[PDB]
A paper describes a structure:
Topoisomerase III (TOP3) is a member of the type IA topoisomerase family, which functions mainly in relaxing the supercoiled DNA and in resolving recombination intermediates during meiosis and DNA repair. We determined the crystal structures of human TOP3β TOPO domain, [name] [name] and OB domains (DUF–OB) and their complex at 3.44 Å, 1.62 Å and 3.6 Å resolutions, respectively.
The [name] structures of [name] and RMI1 are topologically similar but differ in size and orientation relative to the OB-fold domain. The OB-fold domain of [name] contains an insertion loop between β2 and β3 (Val79–Pro92), which is 23 residues shorter than that of RMI1 (Val95–Ser132). Concomitantly, the C-terminal region of the [name] OB-fold domain is not folded into an α-helix, contrary to the secondary structure prediction by PSIPRED. Limited digestion with chymotrypsin cleaved the C-terminus of [name] OB-fold at Trp161, which is positioned in the middle of the predicted α-helix. The insertion loop of [name] is completely disordered in the apo [name] and becomes ordered upon binding to TOP3β with some flexibility, as judged from high temperature factors. Comparison among the two apo [name] structures in the asymmetric unit and the TOP3β-bound [name] structure exhibited two different conformations around the N- and C-terminal ends of β3 and β4, respectively. β3 and β4 in one of the two apo [name] molecules and the TOP3β-bound [name] are one residue shorter than those in the other apo [name] molecule. The Arg93-mediated hydrogen bonds stabilize the shorter β3 and β4, which might be appropriate for binding to TOP3β. We found a positively charged area that could be considered as the potential DNA/RNA-binding site in DUF–OB of [name].
Residue numbers in the entry: -3 to 78, 91 to 161
């Protein structure tokens, strides 16, 4: 019934790398009697993690003191700046901001990639002087957009 269905949906979300708060998951669920992980994910893709996400990044991730970050985990792109292409990404878990550099041959992130886009990081990601080092091996674009995204609330 609704209790066990919410439980198995919550398990599926965590297994996929999402870190949403309990209140966030309720917000993304259209009814306690119509729990559908696809629809929870669709709404979350198109929602600001500052509103629905749970903290999972280390507070000092930009300090240099953190050297690695293990996936799976879903992050949100706040801003993008521009042989493979190289982009600089400002990202957030909804609580802590971090910065990445991304090298992509297959070109699935561009400077046109909308703010609010979600990406999933997989495996162990190196962080070199505060920059996460991303490439096509450890980064998957999940999509979504957060319209009219404001970087600083």
């Amino acid at each position: 019934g609704p209790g066990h269905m919410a439980q198995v949906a919550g398990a599926a979300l965590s297994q996929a790398g999402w870190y949403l708060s309990d209140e966030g998951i309720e917000a993304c669920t259209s009814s306690p009697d119509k729990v559908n992980v696809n629809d929870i994910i669709l709404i979350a893709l198109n929602t600001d993690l500052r509103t629905i996400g749970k903290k999972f990044l280390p507070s000092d991730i930009n300090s240099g003191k953190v050297e690695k970050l293990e996936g799976p985990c879903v992050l949100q792109i706040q801003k993008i700046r521009n042989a493979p292409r190289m982009l600089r990404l400002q990202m957030t878990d909804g609580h802590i901001s971090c910065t990445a550099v991304e090298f992509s041959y297959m070109s699935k992130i561009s400077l046109n990639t909308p703010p609010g886009t979600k990406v999933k990081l997989s495996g162990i990601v190196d962080i070199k002087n505060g920059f996460l080092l991303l490439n096509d091996s450890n980064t998957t674009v999940l999509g979504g957009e957060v319209e009219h995204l404001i970087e600083k609330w």
